[PDB]
Write an enzyme that holds these catalytic residues in place. Structure first.
Site, PDB file in Angstrom:
ATOM      1  N   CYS A  32     -10.818  63.361-113.999  1.00 51.37           N
ATOM      2  CA  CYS A  32      -9.405  63.772-114.231  1.00 51.37           C
ATOM      3  C   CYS A  32      -8.790  64.322-112.938  1.00 51.37           C
ATOM      4  O   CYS A  32      -9.492  64.647-112.001  1.00 51.37           O
ATOM      5  CB  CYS A  32      -9.369  64.848-115.311  1.00 51.37           C
ATOM      6  SG  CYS A  32      -7.788  65.680-115.600  1.00 51.37           S
ATOM      7  N   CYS A  35      -7.440  68.535-113.621  1.00 53.61           N
ATOM      8  CA  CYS A  35      -8.659  69.375-113.762  1.00 53.61           C
ATOM      9  C   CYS A  35      -9.289  69.587-112.386  1.00 53.61           C
ATOM     10  O   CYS A  35      -9.814  70.643-112.096  1.00 53.61           O
ATOM     11  CB  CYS A  35      -9.661  68.677-114.678  1.00 53.61           C
ATOM     12  SG  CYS A  35      -9.124  68.294-116.362  1.00 53.61           S
TER      13      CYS A  35
END
Length: 105
Positions: A32, A35
Protein backbone atom coordinates in the site's frame (compact mmCIF):
# COMPACT_ATOMS: atom_id res chain seq x y z
CA UNK A 1 17.85 -1.54 12.92
CA UNK A 2 14.39 -2.05 11.43
CA UNK A 3 13.77 -5.67 10.38
CA UNK A 4 11.18 -7.21 8.06
CA UNK A 5 9.44 -10.45 9.05
CA UNK A 6 8.04 -13.09 6.67
CA UNK A 7 6.62 -15.92 8.80
CA UNK A 8 5.66 -16.92 12.35
CA UNK A 9 8.66 -19.14 13.00
CA UNK A 10 10.68 -16.02 12.30
CA UNK A 11 8.62 -13.62 14.41
CA UNK A 12 9.73 -15.94 17.23
CA UNK A 13 13.47 -15.86 16.62
CA UNK A 14 13.38 -12.07 16.18
CA UNK A 15 12.05 -11.76 19.73
CA UNK A 16 14.72 -14.25 20.79
CA UNK A 17 17.59 -12.45 19.06
CA UNK A 18 16.39 -9.04 20.23
CA UNK A 19 17.66 -9.76 23.75
CA UNK A 20 15.36 -7.93 26.17
CA UNK A 21 15.55 -4.28 25.07
CA UNK A 22 12.24 -2.82 23.93
CA UNK A 23 10.90 -4.52 20.82
CA UNK A 24 8.32 -2.43 18.96
CA UNK A 25 6.54 -3.81 15.87
CA UNK A 26 4.95 -1.93 12.96
CA UNK A 27 2.06 -4.01 11.64
CA UNK A 28 1.32 -2.26 8.34
CA UNK A 29 1.17 -2.89 4.58
CA UNK A 30 4.35 -2.45 2.52
CA UNK A 31 2.58 -2.66 -0.84
CA UNK A 32 0.00 0.00 0.00
CA UNK A 33 1.05 3.65 -0.35
CA UNK A 34 -0.61 5.72 2.41
CA UNK A 35 0.46 2.97 4.81
CA UNK A 36 4.07 3.27 3.67
CA UNK A 37 3.80 7.06 3.67
CA UNK A 38 4.40 6.98 7.42
CA UNK A 39 7.55 4.88 6.94
CA UNK A 40 9.98 7.84 6.91
CA UNK A 41 8.78 8.31 10.50
CA UNK A 42 8.99 4.81 12.02
CA UNK A 43 11.83 3.76 9.71
CA UNK A 44 13.92 6.79 10.70
CA UNK A 45 14.13 5.63 14.31
CA UNK A 46 16.53 3.01 12.95
CA UNK A 47 19.46 5.39 13.45
CA UNK A 48 17.94 7.57 16.19
CA UNK A 49 17.18 4.90 18.80
CA UNK A 50 20.11 2.49 18.49
CA UNK A 51 19.30 0.94 21.87
CA UNK A 52 15.86 -0.22 20.68
CA UNK A 53 14.94 -2.87 18.10
CA UNK A 54 12.29 -2.14 15.47
CA UNK A 55 10.39 -4.59 13.27
CA UNK A 56 8.08 -4.29 10.27
CA UNK A 57 5.41 -6.89 9.46
CA UNK A 58 3.67 -7.01 6.08
CA UNK A 59 -0.01 -7.87 6.49
CA UNK A 60 0.18 -9.12 2.88
CA UNK A 61 2.67 -12.02 3.03
CA UNK A 62 2.67 -12.42 6.83
CA UNK A 63 -1.06 -12.66 7.59
CA UNK A 64 -0.13 -15.49 9.96
CA UNK A 65 1.56 -13.11 12.36
CA UNK A 66 -1.01 -10.36 11.96
CA UNK A 67 -3.88 -12.77 12.48
CA UNK A 68 -1.92 -13.76 15.57
CA UNK A 69 -2.25 -10.32 17.12
CA UNK A 70 -5.88 -10.13 15.96
CA UNK A 71 -5.30 -6.81 14.16
CA UNK A 72 -8.14 -5.28 12.16
CA UNK A 73 -6.73 -1.93 11.04
CA UNK A 74 -3.34 -0.68 9.85
CA UNK A 75 -1.01 0.79 10.73
CA UNK A 76 -0.97 -0.93 14.15
CA UNK A 77 1.95 -0.49 16.55
CA UNK A 78 2.73 -3.18 19.14
CA UNK A 79 5.20 -3.34 22.04
CA UNK A 80 6.92 -6.67 22.85
CA UNK A 81 9.38 -7.34 25.69
CA UNK A 82 11.29 -10.56 26.39
CA UNK A 83 8.76 -12.02 23.95
CA UNK A 84 5.73 -10.77 25.91
CA UNK A 85 3.24 -8.12 24.81
CA UNK A 86 3.11 -5.12 27.17
CA UNK A 87 1.66 -2.27 25.10
CA UNK A 88 -0.30 -1.80 21.87
CA UNK A 89 -1.96 1.17 20.19
CA UNK A 90 -3.09 1.70 16.58
CA UNK A 91 -3.66 4.84 14.50
CA UNK A 92 -1.55 6.86 12.05
CA UNK A 93 0.24 8.73 14.86
CA UNK A 94 3.99 9.34 15.12
CA UNK A 95 4.46 11.92 17.87
CA UNK A 96 2.93 9.17 19.99
CA UNK A 97 5.51 6.46 19.26
CA UNK A 98 8.20 8.61 20.88
CA UNK A 99 6.45 9.28 24.18
CA UNK A 100 5.06 5.74 24.07
CA UNK A 101 8.58 4.32 23.87
CA UNK A 102 9.39 6.59 26.76
CA UNK A 103 6.65 4.64 28.50
CA UNK A 104 8.41 1.25 28.68
CA UNK A 105 11.94 2.64 28.02
Amino acid sequence: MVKQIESKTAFQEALDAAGDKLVVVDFSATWCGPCKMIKPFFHSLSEKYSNVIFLEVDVDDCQDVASECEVKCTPTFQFFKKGQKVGEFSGANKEKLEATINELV
